[PDB]
Ligand binder design. Structure first.
Ligand SMILES: [Zn+2]
Ligand SMILES: [Zn+2]
Ligand SMILES: [Zn+2]
Ligand SMILES: [Zn+2]
Lengths: 751, 303
C-alpha cells in the first residue's frame, strides 16, 4: 500500500512512497502550482512499512523496513556534509525472519524508533532499538502481534500497541504492567494533537472512536462503509477534524469531532481514484494525495459558506474567518441587468412622471426595449383624442365591436368612404393624422426621412399605389443595394389568372430575408377573400396588421381575427396588445402575465394610473402592484420620491385614502380642534394649551398665512408641547424637557 | 457579471451564519466561541463594530433580524434546547425571554411576515414545530405558545411564505435531513385554516426522497404563483399554483448538478429573480431566468 509522507521540516517538499523512493519539492499540482523532483533512490526492494527521521538534521533521511525484515535508514537529499554517516545505508538485522508491520520514532527522542513485526511464535514483536549515530534495548509483547504501535505525544514514558484482537498500552518504567481492553478495531491507532486523551481504530468497513480516560467502550460508532478503510489520521492544522479513506474511491470521508452530532462531509480531489492521502504539517487545510498514474494534485477541505442579500443587489458571503462581497458594480456597459437595478436607476430619473408629453418616458427608460416604446406611444395617442374631443380606453376590440355595414372588394382599380369606427382605429394605429385627413402622405413622408423605406414601401402599396411606390422603392434604393433588383419583379403583377408570374412568385418568397417585402408579395399572390399570409406573420408589427384588417376585411370577418389575436396577446404577455385590450378587465390579465414574465411593477403602476376607469382601479391586483412598488421605494431609502409618487397618485385615483395619524383634542369638550379667536377652541371657545417657552396660547389661522414656526409640537412620551421654532431653538444647546420637574430627553428618544 | 472583493472585518473564530437587516446597514454574525457581533456601516463605506457578547451554553447555529417597525430585535437558536430574543437599549443589548419548551436541539428560528404581527416559529430535532406570539408590542418579555405541529421526522429547516395579499392564507414549509434507508418524502407544506383555526397538511413533495439541508421561498411581487427552492445533492426549483385546504398544481422548472457536491444554503434577492447557492466545493454560483423562461447560470465565484 503506497502512501505519502510529508517531510518533517519542509513546507513545499513532499515525499510519496512508491516502487522507488521519490521526493518532490514545490508535475502540475494545480493551475498555478508545479512540483519538481529532487532525487530518487531505489536500493530498497520489497518495501512494506516506512518512516522518516524526526530531527531536522539529517534532512530527507527516512527509515524503511523491507519485506525480509531489513531496516536500513536511507537518505535521499544532496548531502555532502553528513554529521554521522555511520547509519548511512546501515542495516539492523532482527533476530527473526519476518516482515515489519509498523514503526514509529518516539516524539520526545530523535534517535529512538520502535517497530512491531509479524505474528511470531515465541519471539518478540515490538522492541526499542537505539539508532545511536546489535540487539534491541527493550523487547516485550509476548503472545501478541503488533498490528500497530504509537507513542504518547505528552508522556515521555508511555506507549500503546495493537495486538491481534486487543489494544494494550505500554510504559517505560514497567513492561508487564498494562491495562487491556478488548475491541473490534485495532488498526489506525493515533493521537490528535489538540486532544491527547482521544484514540481511534478501524475495523474493516466500520470505524470506532475511543477516549483514553474511559477507554472501555467506543464513544462513537460511525456508519459502516462498502469498501474497507485504507488509512486513518487526524488533521494537523485545524482542530477537531478526522478523516478516513477507502479503496477505489475518488471522494474521501471527513468527519468532525467538535460536537462534544458529528457533522459528516466528503471531498472529491479529482475524477480519478486516489491511492492515499496525507495532511501537510504546516499548510492550512491542505491535503496531498497521489494517483497510480504518476499524477498528483493537492486538494483542499473547504469550510461551509453562509449567504445574505441586500436591497442594493449586493451579495455577501462568509468563508471561514473572512467576509467577501460581490455585485455588478458597473462591471461593464453591456445589456441584461437585473430588474432591481433597472428600476432603481429609472426611479432616479423621474420615469413615468412626465404628464405634458407622454412619449418621452421611453427615452427616460434607459436602453431600447421595443415593448416600452409601443406602450408609451399608444398611451400618448390615446390622450390627444380626449383632449381634442372614455370610449377610447376600452380598446380597438370595443370600438370595432359595434361596426355595421361594409363591402368586400374584389377589383383592383389602382379611405374617406369607410366607417368612422374604422377611422378612429386607424387614428390610434397612427397611419393617418388626427381628423378628416384623406391622405397617407404625411405618414409616408415621415417614414422615408428616418431611413426606413421598405416598411414605407409596404404601407404605400397597401393602399393601391403600385406606380406611386415604384419610386419609393427604387429612388431611395441606390445609396447605402439590391432593392432595384428586388423591385424589378414588382412591375409584374395585378390580378392575372394561372400564369408564369403568379405561379412561382408565391413559391420563392421564402428565399427573401426581410419580412416586410415578404408580406408585400404575400398580398398579391392570394385568392381574393383570404389573406392568411398577410394577417398571420409574427415579424410584422401588430400596428400594421391591425390597420390592414381595418381597411380590407369584412364586418363579420374582422371580429373573429381581433378575438384570436387578442387571445394570443393575452396568453403571451406582449405589451403591444394594449391597443387591442385597452385599460379594461383584459388589460389586467395582460399586465399580470407581463409581471409574471419579467417582474416589473414600475411600468404596471405608472401605466394603469393613466386615466383608467374607477372599475379597474378597484381590482385587487393593481393595488397590490402599487403597494409593492411603494415598499420597494421604501427599502432603498428613497423617501422624497415616494412622496412625489403619492401626490401624483392621489391626484388621479381618488379611491384610496391617505395615511391615518393622531389628532389633538380639546380638554373641555373632547372634540377635535382640527378643521372667533384663532386662540380659542372652535367648539366651546376656551383657551388652547400654551407654549412652554413663550407662555402664549397656541393657535393657527384656518404671502404665507400659517408658517411652519407656529405649528404644534409635542413629545409622544411625556406630552409637553410648544411652538416649533421655540422648541427647535431650545433643543440645540440643552437636552431635557423645558417643563419643570420633567426628565425626558425628548430629542434623544429617536436619533 | 459579478465581481468579488474582500471586506475588512476581523474575526478570531469560524463564522456559522450571516444575516442582514431591512435596509442593509447592520449585520449580525455568530462564531465558534459562542459570540455574536453587530456591524454597522458608514457614509464612507467601511464597517465598524458595535457589540460583542457570549450568549448560550452550547453551540450557536443561527441569528436573524426583525422588521424595524418593532424596534431592534434579534433571535438566536442554539444546541442547549433554547432560543433567545435580544433588544438594543441605548448601546448594550439585553435579554428579554428564553423559550425552553423544547426537549432536543433547536435547528432553525425564523420571524414571521409583518402583517400577522410579531410572531416567531422554531423547529427542533424531535419532529416538533412551534409558533409563538407577543400580544403586546411594547412588552417583549411576555410571549405565548399558540400552535404545535408534529412531523414524524427530523426537522432541519423552515421557511415562511412572504406573500401579503388578501387571497393567500399563511403558509410554512418544513424539511428533513434524515438518512433513513427508505422512500419517504422529506418536504411537506402546512397551511392555515381560518375556520377551525388550526394548521393542516396541504401538500407533500413526493419526488424529493433524499436528504435536504435547506429550503427557501421567494418574494411574491404580485405573481400568480409561488416559487420554492430546495438544497439536496442537487439544486431544484418548484412552482405551486392555486386551483378544506386549497389544492396546488406542483411543477418543476429547474434541476442543476453543477456542484458535484452537497449544496448547503439557498437564498433569494429582494425581487425574486436571482438565486445564490453554496456547495461543498468552495464556490458560490448565481442563477437567473432568461427570455425563454429557462434557468441558466450567470456567474461563478470562488471563495
Ligand atoms: Zn373645546
Ligand atoms: Zn418627553
Ligand atoms: Zn416633559
Ligand atoms: Zn411659543
Amino acid at each position: 500500500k503506497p502512501d505519502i509522507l510529508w517531510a518533517p521540516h519542509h513546507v513545499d517538499r513532499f515525499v510519496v512512497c512508491d516502487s522507488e523512493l521519490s521526493l518532490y519539492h514545490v508535475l502540475r499540482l494545480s493551475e498555478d502550482s508545479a512540483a519538481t523532483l529532487l532525487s530518487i533512490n531505489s536500493d530498497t526492494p520489497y518495501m512494506k512499512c516506512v518512516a522518516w527521521y524526526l530531527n531536522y538534521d539529517p534532512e530527507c533521511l527516512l527509515a524503511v523496513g523491507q519485506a525480509n525484515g531489513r531496516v536500513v535508514l536511507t537518505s535521499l537529499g544532496q548531502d555532502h556534509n553528513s554529521k554521522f554517516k555511520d547509519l548511512i545505508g546501515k542495516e539492523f538485522v532482527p533476530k527473526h525472519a519476518r516482515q515489519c508491520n509498523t514503526l514509529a520514532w518516539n516524539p520526545l527522542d530523535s534517535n529512538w524508533l520502535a517497530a512491531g513485526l509479524d505474528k511470531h511464535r515465541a519471539d518478540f514483536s515490538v522492541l526499542i532499538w537505539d539508532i545511536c549515530s546489535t540487539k534491541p534495548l527493550y523487547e516485550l509483547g509476548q503472545n501478541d502481534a503488533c498490528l500497530s504501535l504509537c507513542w504518547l505525544p505528552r508522556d515521555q514514558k508511555l506507549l500503546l500497541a495493537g495486538m491481534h484482537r486487543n489494544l494494550a498500552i505500554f510504559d517505560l518504567r514497567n513492561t508487564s504492567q498494562k491495562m487491556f481492553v478488548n475491541t473490534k478495531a485495532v488498526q489506525g491507532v493515533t493521537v490528535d494533537p489538540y486532544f491527547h486523551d482521544r484514540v481511534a481504530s478501524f475495523y474493516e468497513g466500520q470505524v470506532a472512536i475511543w477516549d483514553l480516560r474511559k477507554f472501555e467502550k467506543p464513544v462513537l460508532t460511525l456508519t459502516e462503509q462498502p469498501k474497507p478503510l485504507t488509512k486513518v489520521a487526524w488533521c494537523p492544522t485545524r482542530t477537531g477534524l478526522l478523516a478516513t479513506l477507502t479503496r477505489d474511491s475518488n471522494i474521501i470521508r471527513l468527519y468532525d469531532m467538535q460536537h462534544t452530532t458529528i457533522i459528516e462531509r466528503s471531498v472529491q480531489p479529482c475524477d480519478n481514484y486516489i491511492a492515499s492521502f496525507a495532511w501537510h504539517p504546516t499548510s492550512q487545510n491542505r491535503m496531498i494525495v497521489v494517483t497510480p498514474n504518476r499524477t498528483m494534485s493537492d486538494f483542499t477541505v473547504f469550510e461551509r459558506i453562509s449567504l445574505a442579500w441586500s436591497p442594493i443587489t449586493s451579495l455577501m458571503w462568509a468563508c471561514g474567518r473572512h467576509l467577501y462581497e460581490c455585485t455588478e458594480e458597473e462591471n461593464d456597459n453591456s445589456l441584461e441587468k437585473d430588474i432591481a437595478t433597472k428600476m432603481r436607476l429609472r426611479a432616479l430619473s423621474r420615469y413615468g412622471l412626465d404628464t405634458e408629453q407622454v412619449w418621452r418616458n421611453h427615452i427616460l427608460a434607459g436602453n431600447e426595449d421595443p415593448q416600452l416604446k409601443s406602450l408609451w406611444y399608444t398611451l400618448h395617442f390615446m390622450k390627444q383624442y380626449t383632449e381634442d374631443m372614455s370610449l377610447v380606453y376600452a380598446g380597438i376590440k370595443s370600438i370595432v365591436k359595434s361596426s355595421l355595414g361594409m363591402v368586400e372588394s374584389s377589383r383592383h382599380n389602382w379611405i374617406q368612404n369607410l366607417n368612422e369606427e374604422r377611422i378612429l382605429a386607424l387614428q390610434l394605429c397612427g397611419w393617418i393624422k388626427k381628423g378628416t385627413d384623406v391622405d397617407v402622405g404625411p405618414f409616408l413622408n415621415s417614414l422615408v426621412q428616418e431611413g426606413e423605406w421598405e416598411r414605407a414601401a409596404a404601407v404605400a402599396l397597401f393602399n393601391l399605389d403600385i406606380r406611386r411606390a415604384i419610386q419609393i422603392l427604387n429612388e431611395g434604393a441606390s445609396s447605402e443595394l439590391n432593392l432595384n433588383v428586388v423591385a424589378m419583379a414588382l412591375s409584374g403583377y395585378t390580378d392575372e389568372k394561372n400564369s408564369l408570374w403568379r405561379e412561382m412568385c408565391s413559391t420563392l418568397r421564402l428565399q427573401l430575408n426581410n419580412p416586410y417585402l415578404c408580406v408585400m408579395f404575400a398580398f398579391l399572390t392570394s385568392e381574393t377573400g383570404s389573406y392568411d399570409g398577410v394577417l398571420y406573420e409574427n415579424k410584422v408589427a401588430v400596428r400594421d396588421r391591425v390597420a390592414f384588417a381595418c381597411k380590407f376585411l369584412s364586418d363579420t370577418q374582422l371580429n373573429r381575427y381581433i378575438e384570436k389575436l387578442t387571445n394570443e396577446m393575452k396568453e403571451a404577455g406582449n405589451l403591444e396588445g394594449i391597443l387591442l385590450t385597452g385599460l379594461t378587465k383584459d388589460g389586467v390579465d395582460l399586465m399580470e402575465s407581463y409581471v409574471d414574465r419579467t417582474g416589473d411593477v414600475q411600468t404596471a403602476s405608472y401605466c394603469m394610473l393613466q386615466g383608467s376607469p374607477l372599475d379597474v382601479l378597484k381590482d385587487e391586483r393593481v393595488q397590490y402592484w402599487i403597494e409593492n412598488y411603494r415598499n420597494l421605494l421604501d427599502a432603498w431609502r428613497f423617501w422624497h420620491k415616494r412622496a412625489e409618487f403619492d401626490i401624483h397618485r392621489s391626484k388621479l385615483d381618488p379611491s384610496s385614502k391617505p395615511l391615518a395619524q393622531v389628532f389633538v383634542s380639546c380638554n373641555f369638550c373632547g372634540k377635535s380642534i382640527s378643521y372667533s379667536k384663532v386662540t380659542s377652541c372652535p367648539g366651546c371657545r376656551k383657551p388652547l394649551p400654551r407654549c412652554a417657552l413663550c407662555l402664549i396660547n397656541m393657535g393657527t389661522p384656518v404671502k404665507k398665512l400659517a408658517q411652519f414656526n407656529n405649528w404644534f409640537t409635542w413629545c409622544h412620551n411625556c406630552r409637553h408641547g410648544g411652538h416649533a421654532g421655540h422648541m427647535l431653538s431650545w433643543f440645540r444647546d440643552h437636552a431635557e424637557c423645558p417643563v419643570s420637574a420633567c426628565t425626558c430627553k425628548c430629542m434623544q428618544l429617536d436619533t | 457579471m459579478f465581481v468579488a472583493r474582500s471586506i475588512a472585518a476581523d474575526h478570531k473564530d469560524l463564522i456559522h451564519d450571516v444575516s442582514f437587516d431591512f435596509h442593509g446597514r447592520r449585520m449580525a454574525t455568530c462564531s465558534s466561541d459562542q459570540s455574536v457581533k453587530v456591524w454597522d456601516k458608514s457614509e464612507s463605506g467601511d464597517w465598524h463594530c458595535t457589540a460583542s457578547w457570549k450568549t448560550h451554553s452550547g453551540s450557536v447555529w443561527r441569528v436573524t433580524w426583525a422588521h424595524p417597525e418593532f424596534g431592534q430585535v434579534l433571535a438566536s437558536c442554539s444546541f442547549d434546547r433554547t432560543a433567545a430574543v435580544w433588544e438594543e437599549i441605548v448601546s448594550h443589548w439585553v435579554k428579554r425571554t428564553t423559550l425552553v419548551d423544547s426537549r432536543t436541539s433547536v435547528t432553525d428560528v425564523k420571524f414571521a411576515p409583518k402583517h400577522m404581527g410579531l410572531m416567531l416559529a422554531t423547529c427542533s430535532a424531535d419532529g416538533i414545530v412551534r409558533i409563538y406570539e407577543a400580544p403586546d408590542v411594547m412588552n417583549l418579555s411576555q410571549w405565548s405558545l399558540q400552535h404545535e405541529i408534529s412531523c414524524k421526522l427530523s426537522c432541519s429547516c423552515i421557511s415562511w411564505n412572504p406573500s401579503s395579499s388578501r387571497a393567500h392564507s399563511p403558509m410554512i414549509a418544513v424539511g428533513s435531513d434524515d438518512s433513513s434507508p427508505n422512500a419517504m418524502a422529506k418536504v411537506q407544506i402546512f397551511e392555515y385554516n381560518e375556520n377551525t383555526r388550526k394548521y393542516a397538511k396541504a401538500e407533500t413533495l413526493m419526488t424529493v426522497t433524499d436528504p435536504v439541508h435547506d429550503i427557501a421561498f421567494a418574494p411574491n411581487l404580485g405573481r400568480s404563483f409561488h416559487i420554492l427552492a430546495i438544497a439536496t445533492k442537487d439544486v431544484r426549483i418548484f412552482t405551486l399554483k392555486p386551483v378544506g385546504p386549497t389544492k396546488f398544481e406542483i411543477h418543476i422548472v429547474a434541476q442543476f448538478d453543477n456542484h458535484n457536491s452537497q449544496v448547503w444554503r439557498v437564498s433569494w434577492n429582494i425581487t425574486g429573480t436571482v438565486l445564490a447557492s453554496s456547495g461543498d466545493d468552495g464556490c458560490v454560483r448565481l442563477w437567473k431566468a432568461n427570455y425563454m423562461d429557462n434557468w441558466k447560470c450567470t456567474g461563478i465565484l470562488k471563495g
